[PDB]
Each structure stands twice: as structure tokens, then as C-alpha cells.
Design a protein around this nucleic acid. Structure first.
Ligand code: ZN
Length: 446
RNA sequence: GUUCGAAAUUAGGUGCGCUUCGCGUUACAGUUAAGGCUCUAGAGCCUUAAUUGUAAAACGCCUAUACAGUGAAGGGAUAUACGCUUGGGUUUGUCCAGCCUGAGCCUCUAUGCCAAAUGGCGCCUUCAUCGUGGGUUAGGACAU
DNA sequence: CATTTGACCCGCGAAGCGCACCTAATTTCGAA
DNA sequence: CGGGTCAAATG
């Protein structure tokens, strides 16, 4: 093998071929997770609002009444409850709800049910039993316990090696799980400081995670010492990296980033391969995919042929203020940059915007300016519900460009067989695709 | 006695999943503040910006045998499910991740909250009732 | 009038829970 | 952070 991997690169120094691994999948999953969290928060907000509306209408506070107005507006921003006394606390929102429903002449049971709606848990929190480490011995596929549920077994695993009799071992085990008793025992039955910490840690600490062995095998681990450490749960991004490297190996070991070492070591054997744990070889993405974003995350405004969007003054770049629609605020922003000298950093800053007089919002917060969107065109605009989005995956091929079947019903501009990366006699696609900085129209299939 | 292997423990980092709280975006509607034009100091319209409210945030796919509210009763560690067995939806060229989830079950895993036993509560179940919902999707491989 | 050709575009923050998989170190037991 | 966008410019 000779594989050696590190940082963003790897080398199969059997051969001396270097390979570049994907160093993005982690950040892509991170934002595929932030998006899912945003979506689920919004769905729970809709659930809660539906329930609150139904209840308020059921008790005579119909939508036209001020009680409904106030309570429904309060239910949009209910505050946080992870702690107790950028957001208000659940208690302040519920205090305002009580105030409004009292002023509405509501009964105690009604206010209490509205409070229950404001405190309801719409999606269960399930985290106590999610990741399931199975027992290491080959004949025991059963679940290992959480280490906090078998503190007795873990304490026994340590006390079974003390120079004392079994009766004193059992007494000590029962005492530590009787506080000064264990201290006196150790003070008399001199024991190593590390062993004493370990037993105290098992007795007292918050034991996250599971044990390598089940109940029936925690103590028997010495009988299985020759079996190496096993792995079952590796990060999908590291899995993608390592499996791309392994696929390269399959098409075509002192393996010196260290995470996931055992997963490679086990895939390299797939039975007994030994392991000895830009010039890297000398030391030794497809955004059109079916799971990529169909469009941008921030919707755009598309009015009478002009694409614009609101960007904060601290989000509009120096040298680009010409996209700001307002003539007056363009001049104001230019008057701000010939004092700020922001051309280097180009980002501008909250303090600078406030000093320049762009703090116009409710909380003295920096205003926003509508700016025209460069780098986009009409062909990329889609409309879903009220939102207009830029889609970078509008092109799936060219026959005249071919529109994305997942967006044909949403394109604002009506439409008038080389796919991307095909071999022809393609890095960017269109009616005259870019083929490799040369662009041509008369490509032919090859 | 060195080395190596395992387990345990601790700290760091990396990452994965769940549940929320916001800001920002967008659509409409109402206001305020200006800028302009147009009718005639006002009045009508367009712009920008602020402030209010409500609504959308991937497309889709799958579910009404579904889903949630309310009430009653029963069960609640001889119990349930995030567990086990075995699925199904997302799901498509195909296969997956991840999430969700049905039926049976308690051999492994887990089991919360408010008040020493015990007591409520969440929880599970059946029914009655008003109904209109719920899950997943912004990732990876392969083929094309 | 098809090509270069050069600049431009792209959602952020926090909290509460779980978890694994690698480093660093120690104990203990097994071996080779 | 590729896949485009526009307008410009041997054209
Ligand atoms: Zn076992």
C-alpha cells in the first residue's frame, strides 16, 4: 500500500500518485444542517400559531378582536426557555400574554391554556438513546450501556486488582457508590493517586458515552485484549475523503488528520495487512447533484425587470456602492468611504456606519439599502410562492440551454444533448459552452 | 524488565444528530418621513427609507387508515421507546447518510419533570368530539 | 457576431441536549 | 465556490 495522507492531500506511494481529497463536505453538511434547523423552527412556529388561532377563535376572541391581535403577535416571538431568569425570556412573553388576556376579560382556565400553547413542545426532544455502541466481542452484538448506568461494574473493574480480600473489595465498591470511608481506606490501604482519581471519576462524574463492552463483558475485557480497537461511527465527511482515496486505490503500510485512522485500516484490509502508523508525494464537487441546493438561501426582489435585494450598509462592499438603487444613499455611502478608506477591507463596519449616519433603524441599528444584483440574470430567476430566487443549477445541459426539470414550473422568464463535463471535440455550460479559458459553440460529441 | 494490545479514566480537538431562540431575506397590506413629478397652500401617482402587521423560504415526494386540539376512562418500570426484531416514507438509475416513522416485543439500551414512601404531570392506550393537518427534502457514492 | 475577459454573485449568530472518533497522559491486565 | 452573469472589448 504505502498510503500516506495529511491535510487536504494524500499519496499512494506504493507508484507515487498524489490525490486531492474533498475538504468541503464538512462545511456543506454544516450548512445543510443549519438549513434543516431553520426549516424545523419555522414549521414549529406555524404549528404553534395554528393551535393558538384555533383556540382563540373557539373562545370568542375571533381574529378581529384586539385580544387575538395581541396574543397572536406575541406568539411569533415567544422568547427562550433554556435558562431561567437578542431575545426576551419565556417569562416576559407569558407575562404580556397574561396582561393581554386579562384586559380581554378571559377566565383563568383560558389564560392557562394559552400559556400551555406558548410553552408547548411540538417536536419531541429524543437524545437519551440515540447512538448505540455494540459490544466488542464478536459473539455479542448487543448494546453496551451508558457508563453512568454501570458505574458499579466500572468501579469493580478497578477494585478487583487491589491487594485486599474479596469482602473488603465488595465493601469498598458499595461505599464509593459512605464518603469518608473510602478516603480512610485509601489513606490506610495505600493506593496510587491515578487509581483513586479514576474511581472518584467513575463514582461522581457525568459519564458521557458508552463502554466498549456490555454488562456481561466489561470485566472480561482482558480475555479479549488481543482484538484491536474497532470503529462503527465515522464522520460522513471523513468517510467521503477516505472512501474516495480507497476507490482511487481500488482503480489503481507506513501510513503517517489522524482521525478516522481505524476506518482506513479496516477498509484497506477489505484481512491481516500490517500497519505502521504541494510535494506531498515526496513525503509519502458537483453542485448540480440531486442533493445540492436548488437555489440561493436569500430570496431576491424582481420588480419590472430589475433584480434587487436589501443589503445592510455593513454588507455592501466598497467600490460596489454603484449597485445601491437610491441616488441619495449612493452619494452618502461615497461620502462615507472617502473618509473611511474602506477600499482595502471593502466590508465597512458597524461603528463606521453608525458614525456616518446610517443608524436609522428601530434600535439605532444600521439601516439597509436596496442594491441591484450583479452576477445574475433573468434566466436564473425562479419564483416559488412569493419568493424570487437565483438558481445556479438552472442549466442541466445544452441541446440552446436545457432548463432544470426541478425548476421548469418556477422560472420567471419563459424558455425560448451535451451535458456538463462531457468529452467533446466542459467547465461552464450554455449555448456556447466553456470547454477545457476557450469558449466555443460548435462542439461535437466524443 | 522493555515493547506492543486491550480496557478504564481524564483533557483537547474534530466533527455528527436532535430541539429551539433570534437577526437577515422576501411578498402583501397600513402608516410615517422625505424626494420628485402630476391635479390644483394643498391634493393624486411613483421612488427611497423607517416603522407596524401578517405570510413564504428550497422544488417536490409521501401520508386523511394521516395528523393535531379538547374531554372521559384506563395503563404507567409485572410500563413504555430514542431500545430489540422487522419494516415503511424521504427515494430517485441505483445505493446510501440523516431524519421521521408503523407492527410485534422487553433479551440488550434508555426512561424525563414537578412534589421521604407515595402523589400528581409529561408519557402510553381506547373511545367521543371539533376539525385540518403531519414526515422528509438545500448531503455523499454510482450511473447518466 | 461569435469569441475573450474581466469583475461579480453566493445567509449570519446563539443556546440546550446527546453521541463517536482521533491526539495527550495515567492505572491495570495480558502477552512476545 | 462552481457554475454561471453581465457588458466590454483584437470586435
Ligand atoms: Zn457482550
Amino acid at each position: 500500500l504505502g498510503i500516506a495522507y495529511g491535510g487536504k492531500y494524500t499519496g499512494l506511494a506504493v507508484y507515487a500518485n498524489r490525490l486531492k481529497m474533498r475538504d468541503d463536505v464538512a462545511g456543506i453538511l454544516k450548512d445543510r444542517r443549519k438549513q434543516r434547523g431553520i426549516r424545523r423552527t419555522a414549521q414549529t412556529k406555524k404549528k404553534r400559531l395554528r393551535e393558538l388561532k384555533n383556540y382563540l377563535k373557539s373562545i370568542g376572541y375571533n381574529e378581529s378582536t384586539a385580544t387575538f391581535e395581541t396574543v397572536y403577535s406575541l406568539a411569533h416571538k415567544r422568547g427562550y426557555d433554556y435558562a431561567d431568569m437578542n431575545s426576551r425570556h419565556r417569562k416576559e412573553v407569558v407575562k404580556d400574554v397574561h396582561k393581554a388576556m386579562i384586559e380581554g376579560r378571559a377566565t383563568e382556565e383560558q389564560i392557562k391554556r394559552v400559556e400551555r400553547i406558548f410553552n408547548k413542545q411540538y417536536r419531541p426532544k429524543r437524545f437519551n438513546n440515540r447512538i448505540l455502541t455494540k459490544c466488542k466481542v464478536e459473539d455479542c452484538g448487543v448494546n453496551t450501556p451508558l457508563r453512568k448506568n454501570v458505574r458499579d461494574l466500572l468501579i469493580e473493574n478497578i477494585v478487583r486488582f487491589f491487594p485486599i480480600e474479596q469482602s473488603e473489595k465488595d465493601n469498598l465498591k458499595d461505599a464509593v457508590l459512605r464518603r469518608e470511608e473510602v478516603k480512610s481506606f485509601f489513606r490506610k490501604h495505600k493506593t496510587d493517586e491515578h487509581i483513586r482519581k479514576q474511581v472518584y471519576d467513575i463514582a461522581d462524574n457525568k459519564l458521557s458515552g458508552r463502554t466498549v463492552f456490555c454488562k456481561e463483558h466489561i470485566l472480561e475485557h482482558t480475555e479479549h485484549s488481543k482484538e484491536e480497537r474497532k470503529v462503527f461511527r465515522l464522520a460522513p465527511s471523513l468517510k467521503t475523503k477516505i472512501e474516495n482515496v480507497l476507490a482511487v486505490i481500488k482503480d489503481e503500510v507506513v501510513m503517517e488528520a489522524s482521525i478516522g485512522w481505524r476506518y482506513m485500516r479496516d477498509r484497506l484490509r477489505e484481512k491481516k495487512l500490517p500497519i505502521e502508523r504541494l510535494h506531498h508525494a515526496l513525503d509519502a464537487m458537483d453542485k448540480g447533484s440531486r442533493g445540492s441546493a436548488l437555489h440561493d438561501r436569500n430570496p431576491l426582489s424582481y420588480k419590472k425587470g430589475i433584480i434587487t435585494r436589501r443589503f445592510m450598509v455593513t454588507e455592501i462592499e466598497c467600490g460596489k456602492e454603484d449597485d445601491v438603487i437610491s441616488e441619495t444613499y449612493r452619494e452618502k455611502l461615497k461620502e462615507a468611504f472617502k473618509r473611511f478608506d474602506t477600499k482595502k477591507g471593502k466590508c465597512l463596519t458597524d461603528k463606521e456606519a453608525k458614525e456616518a449616519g446610517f443608524c436609522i433603524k428601530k434600535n439605532e441599528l444600521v439601516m439597509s439599502l436596496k442594491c441591484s444584483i450583479k452576477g445574475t440574470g433573468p434566466g436564473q430567476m425562479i419564483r416559488i410562492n412569493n419568493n424570487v430566487f437565483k438558481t445556479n443549477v438552472h442549466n442541466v445541459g445544452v441541446d440552446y440551454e436545457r432548463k432544470n426539470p426541478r425548476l421548469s414550473k418556477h422560472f420567471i422568464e419563459p424558455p425560448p444533448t451535451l451535458k456538463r463535463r462531457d468529452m467533446v471535440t466542459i467547465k461552464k455550460l450554455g449555448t456556447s459552452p466553456t470547454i477545457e479559458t476557450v469558449s466555443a459553440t460548435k462542439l461535437t460529441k466524443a
